[PDB]
Symmetry: C2
Subunit: 130 residues, 2 copies
């Protein structure tokens, strides 16, 4: 299933499976997240809102990643670890693996990847390790 | 705009930009291709019809690529060509490069060129008999 997605209305994160939500992509490329209250579909957020965001999910490692921040710790020891933002570009969910430089998140060979957040809800996480 | 998609409804292919088409993703993960006639939303296909299929697109090398067939031809000598199907699996639009890599990201093909010539739905049996010389 290639339906997993999540929208950020600006205040909170929205996951595709949330009850009532339904995503609607329009002929002009616009998108609109809709919720079902009673028998009425209600506009939660919408693409014309430049603060909002739509992130797709990739099934990989039996899980779904989207546009998160993750901790890539080498399977070896502590030989490598990092916090790199998962990006979707060039037709592939990639991550900085300078611990190549970029590679599919589902192709991380000698490492274990763990989602710890997302650029929206953890804007600060991309810094100061120890 | 993370939005490009196309749906095969069993008989014909539908692209996101076609007038009045609206793709609807439901909470249970189902999808439905709708189409606005006058100002009435009219269904075209569902995820229920197991014949139909939802294919996403990715922008790579300026062009948008969905889940079609392409002919990878070496940027070098024609001592490397192949008609290969683009599958979207594991978070990457991979394509067979077997003819030091078996498969790779279509946007990461290094030494050759890619040219879409059709898709698995409207051009089945397009992956054989291949001339050479």
């Amino acid at each position: 299933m290639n339906t997993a997605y999540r929208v950020w209305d600006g205040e909170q994160m929205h996951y595709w499976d949330d009850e009532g939500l339904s995503l609607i992509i329009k002929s002009n490329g616009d998108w609109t997240l809709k919720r079902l209250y009673t028998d009425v579909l209600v506009p939660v957020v919408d693409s014309t809102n430049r603060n909002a965001a739509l992130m797709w999910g990739a099934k990989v490692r039996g899980k779904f990643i989207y546009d998160r921040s993750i901790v890539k710790i080498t399977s070896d020891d502590k030989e490598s670890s990092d916090v790199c933002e998962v990006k979707f570009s060039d037709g592939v969910f990639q991550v900085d693996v300078s611990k190549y430089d970029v590679t599919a998140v589902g192709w991380v060979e000698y490492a274990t990847i763990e989602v710890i957040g997302d650029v929206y809800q953890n804007p600060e996480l991309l810094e100061g390790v120890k």
